[PDB]
Amino acid sequence: LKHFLNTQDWSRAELDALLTQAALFKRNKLGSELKGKSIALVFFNPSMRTRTSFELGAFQLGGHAVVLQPGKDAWPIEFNLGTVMDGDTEEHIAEVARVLGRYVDLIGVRAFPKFVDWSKDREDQVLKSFAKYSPVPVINMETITHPCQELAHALALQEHFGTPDLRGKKYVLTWTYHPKPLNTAVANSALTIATRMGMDVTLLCPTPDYILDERYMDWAAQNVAESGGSLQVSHDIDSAYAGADVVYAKSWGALPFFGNWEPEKPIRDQYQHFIVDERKMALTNNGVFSHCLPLRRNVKATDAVMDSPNCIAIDEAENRLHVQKAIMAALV
Amino acid sequence: LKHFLNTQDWSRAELDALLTQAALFKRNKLGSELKGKSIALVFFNPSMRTRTSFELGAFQLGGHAVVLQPGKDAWPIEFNLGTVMDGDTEEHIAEVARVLGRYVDLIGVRAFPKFVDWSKDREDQVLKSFAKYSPVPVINMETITHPCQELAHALALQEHFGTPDLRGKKYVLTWTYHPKPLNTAVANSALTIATRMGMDVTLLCPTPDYILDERYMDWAAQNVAESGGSLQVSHDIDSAYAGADVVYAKSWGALPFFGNWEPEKPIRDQYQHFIVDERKMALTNNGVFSHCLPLRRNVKATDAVMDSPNCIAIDEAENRLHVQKAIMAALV
Amino acid sequence: LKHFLNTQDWSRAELDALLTQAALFKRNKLGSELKGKSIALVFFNPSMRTRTSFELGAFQLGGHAVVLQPGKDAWPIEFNLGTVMDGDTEEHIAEVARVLGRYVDLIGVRAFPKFVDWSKDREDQVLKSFAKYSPVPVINMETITHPCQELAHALALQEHFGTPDLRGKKYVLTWTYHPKPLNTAVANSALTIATRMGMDVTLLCPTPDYILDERYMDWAAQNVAESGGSLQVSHDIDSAYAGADVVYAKSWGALPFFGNWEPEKPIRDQYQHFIVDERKMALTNNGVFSHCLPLRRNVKATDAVMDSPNCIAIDEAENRLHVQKAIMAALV
Ligand SMILES: CC(=O)N[C@@H](CCCN)C(=O)O
Ligand SMILES: CC(=O)N[C@@H](CCCN)C(=O)O
Ligand SMILES: CC(=O)N[C@@H](CCCN)C(=O)O
């Protein structure tokens, strides 16, 4: 059975096919690729943009999405094995996935890390459990990676540059400020897709403590070796932005501080200057800027940058609809 | 771009067209006016009747409604301008509306006042912000006015009297008791539509403190001058009910007491006798009674009045479905 | 007007027709039996499996389900009669049902007992009120009985044995352990349908305190007299399981302890050995095992029993979809 858990699991040819199908759906949004079919959108964490895009995507192709929210509509689910369920959990994931598989044709899963222990969050237990027990294809709607965002982002860039071939372009994945420590998911995904596309990627962050998990740094390294781009880590803003063709910002909590965020606060507060502003973008090669959203204005990026004609965040946002339709259509 | 924010913004001819289209949908509810189209129902405050009627209305015309609840599915949204978003708000309304506009064809918005400061609530910030930033038509699902209720009410009255011409009929908008101070929205709307229809309207309330906002009193005055009816405020129950053809009740908190409801409590408790009962209706010209619902029995109106053959509240309730379909069809 | 409140209200011929229609829908799931029709799924208590199955069932037959959750989307509803609604309740059930009846073609209701007083919970007030005031058919989505589960269960058994005639088969409805006292609904329903099908039923429970309400014990007695089976209560595990063809487990709080669960805790904790394990099933006649779900593994039943090829719980779960479609189609 084929699932859409990560772009890294798919071949370049398969990804290219998805992006092209996404482009086709953008030119003709109504169809019957999902006629009479259904997808269960399982939200362990809520998301209006994800619910909206998937729900409409199913509708437009003749299918139907069922929105489920485990944290609000049911007792906790047990994912561990060989336990005596005499605690808080009422049902095991094996039963949840097997039953859903008798009702729907696809299962989408969104489940964020708990931020107490990265060794546990990085195992992607919720998503992997659904993939293990489900008799139908599973789709990652964001856990510790955000593959749907990757393709929406990739498509937006190809559309902006007028070509699917982005090799050679200088790509800057920059950490930006936020009052709280966030999920590294979007950054892990950006690094992954940018290198898979063969761009010359620079991971710009305040200190070595903010470097992403080795797993993704390795995915990126492997992608560069295969696509012909490059991977570099930098803690210097000006040299990173210089000549950049693309600047993608995202804030995230330093991994070494999981379960110990108190001391991480004064650290991030020293880098509020990582905010994407006009000065920094002026250093780029008339590059574009984007963010996965939601974005705190004048904190992650200034109003001037956000409303600049070079900001493609709304186009990338729209593309979530098109790429997800391509993903669902491919899996059924 | 045309929106449905208030009936006052539409011409009499346009409103008449909406009501007539509503009558047509009532005679033939299934159609394709919204085939493949969608509407995002954004609830900042929940409403089962509104979600049900809009959702079914979209379905019956071949479209699809996406139900969103910002207060429960996402962090707070920022509506103010030029601020540094380092507080509770995670995303700005500009981004929320622009992205939704790339997904749906229509956006419905329900957002109640906060009851702390009327000078702030009366600005209709949430609704006006959506209207400002959305690239698609916006529909008021109740904020400080309830235009959808206005048309459902107007249609019910025309159906009851067997004519679209209600000029001359004596219309009594009466305040009624409730243990808590409520939104003036429905009353503002009733006054607006009743006068727009040229009826002889009387605003019956306990004291001058309960008179509606000047904005609506002026809308009403303007409507009478143009339609040929009349507007009058009264604090005397018997003279108001005398000869009435229509009695519409609604409870609301005295505007001068926003952010200071403690002293307003003993005041409203002195007017529990404003309850619509048989004695009062016996003074009318065999007039009809209605309420927007939900209604507390034997508090706002007695069981006898509510179950009287002259109570058309259920018919007005049904009409929410028909008028909203007319509104959505007109805006796409 | 015909409703689906309990299987006991339907004739054997009618039930047989429902089960056969369910079998037909399983062979051809897409249809137009509900084309343009709708059902309001009213959840006073949430259920992902019920929302999913009903919602998809409506969709597959050309209809649409509207999901409503009174406890989270509105103030409390008043069910009592002749009261002055100056308390917590904002709207009366008469208005709720009458209005919904102007919007939808069917109304599903799920409302659990409150566990404080069984004399009150056993009156099925919420469901009976909807049935009384609704102008459209009402469907029990679980209150103090679970008729939809009954038919899904009945169908699974017929499919397992390869025949609709289960007379003579030894049916064991066994209480099982759970750390908390639960609803007797599923057990009441199992006893009801098993006897209606003419099986030789044994109600296995720890003590006389766990015997089900007299109402259902009488339904069962009447069913046996008419179908030709038998009804027996047992507190001895081994004699009950011996030669059993079917074992259906369910945990429930002892009725005599409603509103006084403290002393019931040490009592149930003495019967953890009621867990369905391999030893017990080894005593049966190669019988099947099932549970309505959700099931706590290694508490209600061991992993070995749950994953045994003789466990049909997932098939019974799937059948909720098919039988509910048969029910909705029959009522419209
Ligand atoms: C603010 C926040 O927690 N953002 C989320 C979601 C981003 C995609 N919509 C994150 O950091 O992954
Ligand atoms: C009780 C209450 O707050 N009623 C609301 C909603 C009325 C329309 N359904 C109000 O006063 O506007
Ligand atoms: C654990 C619990 O409360 N179970 C519920 C629902 C069973 C049907 N899904 C009950 O005892 O009725």
Residues of C in contact with B318 (CB under 8 A): 99, 102-103
Q: B121-153 burial, b if ≥16 CB within 10 A, otherwise e?
A: bbebebbbbbbebbebbbbbbbbbbbbbbbbbb
Contact B321, B57 (CB under 8 A): yes
Nearest atom, ligand 3, residue C47 CA: 9
Q: Which domains does chain C have, with CATH numbers?
A: 1-148+320-332 (3.40.50.1370), 149-319 (3.40.50.1370)
**Residue of B330, B328, B326 lying closest to B151 (CA atoms):** B326
Nearest atom, ligand 3, residue C294 CA: 9
CB-ligand 2 contact for B313 (6 Å cutoff):
no
Q: Which two tokens stand for residue A37?
A: 């079919």
Distance CA C329, CA C180 (A): 37
Contact A62, A149 (CB under 8 A): no
* Chain C contact probe: residue of B28, B69, B297, B306 with most C CBs at under 10 A: B297
Min CA distance, C319 vs chain B (Å)? 27
Q: Which two tokens stand for residue C17?
A: 């027709």
Q: Which two tokens stand for residue A48?
A: 């209006």
Helices (H), chain B: 12-27, 48-60, 70-73, 93-103, 118-121, 125-133, 147-161, 185-196, 214-227, 237-241, 264-268, 278-282, 303-306, 313-331
- How many angstroms from the chain centroid is the CA of residue C74? 26
Nearest atom, ligand 2, residue B49 CA: 9
Contact B174, B206 (CB under 8 A): no
Between chains, do C299 and A83 touch, taking CB under 8 Å as contact?
A: no
Helices (H), chain A: 12-27, 48-60, 70-73, 93-103, 118-121, 125-133, 147-161, 185-196, 214-227, 237-241, 264-268, 278-282, 303-306, 313-331
Contact A250, A291 (CB under 8 A): yes
Sign of CA dihedral B9, B14, B19, B23: negative
Q: What residues of chain A, 79 to 138, have a C-beta less than 8 Å from chain C?
A: 82-86, 89-92, 95, 98-100, 102-104
CB-ligand 2 contact for B292 (6 Å cutoff):
yes
Tell how far the Cα of B223 is from the centroid of ligand 2, in angstroms.
Answer: 25
Residues of A in contact with C294 (CB under 8 A): 74-75, 90-91, 95
Min CA distance, B103 vs chain A (Å)? 7
Between chains, do C48 and A68 touch, taking CB under 8 Å as contact?
A: yes
Distance CA A110, CA A49 (A): 12
- Is A295's Cβ below 8 Å from some Cβ in B? yes
**Residue of B275, B316, B18, B295 lying closest to B156 (CA atoms):** B316
CB-ligand 3 contact for C190 (6 Å cutoff):
no
Q: A157-166 burial, b if ≥16 CB within 10 A, otherwise e?
A: bbbbeeeeeb
CB-ligand 2 contact for C90 (6 Å cutoff):
yes
- Is B162's Cβ below 8 Å from some Cβ in C? no
Q: With the CA atoms of C301, C303, C308 and C312 taken in that order, what torsion angle do they form, in degrees rounded to the nearest 10?
A: 50
DSSP A151-168: HHHHHHHHHHHTSS--TT
CA distance from start to end of chain A: 10
Q: With the CA atoms of A226, A230, A232 and A236 taken in that order, what torsion angle do they form, in degrees rounded to the nearest 10?
A: -160
Nearest atom, ligand 2, residue B50 CA: 9
Q: Which of C145, C182, C319 to mutate to test the pocket of ligand 3 (most atoms within 8 A of CB)?
A: C182
The CA-atom distances, in angstroms, between C287 and each of C171, C195, C314 are 9, 18, 16
Question: From atom 2 of ligand 3, which residue's Cα is the shortest distance away?
Answer: C182
What is the CA angle B321-B323-B326, rounded to 5? Answer: 110
Residues of B in contact with C91 (CB under 8 A): 293-296
Q: Which two tokens stand for residue A134?
A: 């489900």
> Which residues on adjacent β-strands are paired with residue C289?
C247, C311
Question: From atom 9 of ligand 1, which residue's Cα is the shortest distance away?
Answer: A293
Pairing of strands A64-68, B106-110: unpaired
Burial status of residue B277 (CB atoms within 10 A of its CB: 0-12, 13-18, 19 or more): middle
Between chains, do A86 and C179 touch, taking CB under 8 Å as contact?
A: yes
**Residue of C317, C290, C311 lying closest to C53 (CA atoms):** C317
Q: What is the SS3 assignment for B205?
A: coil
Categorise residue C86: left if φ over 0, alpha if ψ from -120 to 50, beta otherwise: alpha
CB-ligand 3 contact for C199 (6 Å cutoff):
no
Distance CA C291, CA B167 (A): 65
Distance CA A197, CA B70 (A): 36
Helix (H) / strand (E) element for B181: namely none
Distance CA C186, CA C192 (A): 10
CB-ligand 1 contact for A299 (6 Å cutoff):
no
- Is C66's Cβ below 8 Å from some Cβ in A? no
Distance CA C302, CA C281 (A): 11
Distance CA B229, CA B249 (A): 20
CA distance from start to end of chain B: 10
Q: Which two tokens stand for residue C301?
A: 């039943």
Between chains, do A68 and C59 touch, taking CB under 8 Å as contact?
A: no
Interacting residues of A228 by C-beta distance below 8 A, sequence separation 6+: A167, A198
User: Of the bound ligands, which one is closest to the alpha carbon of residue A186?
Assistant: 1
Contact B192, B8 (CB under 8 A): yes
- Is C278's Cβ below 8 Å from some Cβ in B? no
The CA-atom distances, in angstroms, between A230 and each of A146, A164, A169, C47, C139 are 22, 18, 10, 50, 62
Min CA distance, C325 vs chain B (Å)? 19
Distance CA B9, CA B12 (A): 10
DSSP class of residue B236 equals -
Distance CA B68, CA B70 (A): 6
Resolution to one decimal, Å? 1.8
DSSP class of residue C143 equals S
Q: From the list C48, C52, C299, which residue is nearest A84 (CB)?
A: C299
Contacts 24+ apart (CB under 8 A), A267-271: A267/A206, A267/A207, A267/A209, A268/A177, A268/A178, A268/A181, A268/A206, A270/A206, A271/A175, A271/A177, A271/A206
CB-ligand 2 contact for C95 (6 Å cutoff):
no
Distance CA B323, CA B328 (A): 9
Backbone phi, psi, residue B230, to 5°? -160, 155
CB-ligand 3 contact for C185 (6 Å cutoff):
yes
Interacting residues of A14 by C-beta distance below 8 A, sequence separation 6+: none
Q: What is the SS3 assignment for B46?
A: coil
Question: From atom 5 of ligand 3, which residue's Cα is the shortest distance away?
Answer: C183
What is the CA angle C31-C36-C42, rounded to 5? Answer: 100
Based on C-alpha coordinates, what's the Rg of chain A?
A: 20
- Minimum Cα–Cα distance from C30: chain A residue: A36
User: Of the bound ligands, which one is closest to the alpha carbon of residue B152?
Assistant: 2
Residues of B in contact with A294 (CB under 8 A): 74-75, 90-91, 95
Helix (H) / strand (E) element for A64: namely strand A64-68
CA distance from start to end of chain C: 10
Pairing of strands B38-43, A288-290: unpaired
Helix axis angle for A313-331 and B93-103, nearest 10°, is 40
**Residue of A62, A60, A54, A52 lying closest to A30 (CA atoms):** A60
Q: Which two tokens stand for residue A83?
A: 């336990």
Contact B154, B326 (CB under 8 A): no
**Residue of C128, C119, C122 lying closest to C185 (CA atoms):** C122
CB-ligand 1 contact for B16 (6 Å cutoff):
no
**Cis bond before residue A135 (omega within 30° of 0):** no
Between chains, do A95 and C55 touch, taking CB under 8 Å as contact?
A: no
Helix axis angle for A313-331 and A12-27, nearest 10°, is 110
CB atoms within 10 A of CB C32: 11
Nearest atom, ligand 1, residue A50 CA: 9
Helices (H), chain C: 12-27, 48-60, 70-73, 93-103, 118-121, 125-133, 147-161, 185-196, 214-227, 237-241, 264-268, 278-282, 303-306, 313-331
